[PDB]
């Protein structure tokens, strides 16, 4: 009896499947991926260990250093391997996005975009 909410939740959950599988193949968790992402995003501005505590973190950074994702040290920087990973995950999300229209006709593709915009605007 709440079919729109059910479909929105379920599709929303499926948007994450490919990313979770890659994290697992790489031996990383969601906290590690996000941390690498956060550092990649903010390292030019400059980020220190305190900043990551407020947005252990010591042991995680050590794990990420051992995997060659983060530079050993003071500001924190991802290594090229870390930047490459962020790019990889972005591309995963692009492939998932492209899959949304797989089962849809041209008209359905346009209508979905128009309607989702309207729904999102209304709440």
């Amino acid at each position: 009896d709440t079919p729109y909410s059910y479909l929105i939740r379920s599709i929303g959950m499926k948007l994450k499947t490919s990313a979770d599988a890659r994290l697992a193949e790489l031996g990383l968790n969601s906290q590690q991926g996000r941390m690498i992402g956060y550092i990649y995003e903010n390292q030019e501005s400059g980020i220190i260990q305190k900043d990551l505590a407020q947005f252990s973190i010591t042991s995680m950074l050590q794990g990420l250093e051992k995997k060659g994702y983060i530079e050993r040290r003071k500001n924190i920087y991802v290594l090229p391997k870390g930047a490459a990973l962020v790019e990889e995950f972005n591309n995963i999300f692009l492939e998932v996005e492209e899959s949304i229209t797989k089962g849809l006709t041209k008209d359905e593709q346009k209508q979905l975009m128009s309607i989702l915009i309207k729904v999102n605007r209304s709440m």
Copy 2:
């Protein structure tokens, strides 16, 4: 987040619905998983529900909590789980919250847009 436009909107709408719902439930010291669980029990109890069927957040803890608060009981027909009247009243308040959230999805849409959205979302969900 806006580099993947459909995904952006789907998650934005999802997160807005969930925030609406989590907040309206939280005031009642409830959460959506408890509501779903009680609802499932209420709907299927005459079929015979055991803890195993619910397994397939700690389920044992959540069931003990619902039982301690007087919402469900375990009856000797493995014991079967049933909603008590206080729990049936609570299912209805849960359901009404979910129904108002559902209606917020379609407020701004024509009947045709509602029909198109249902049809399309079924297809998208099937395809992945």
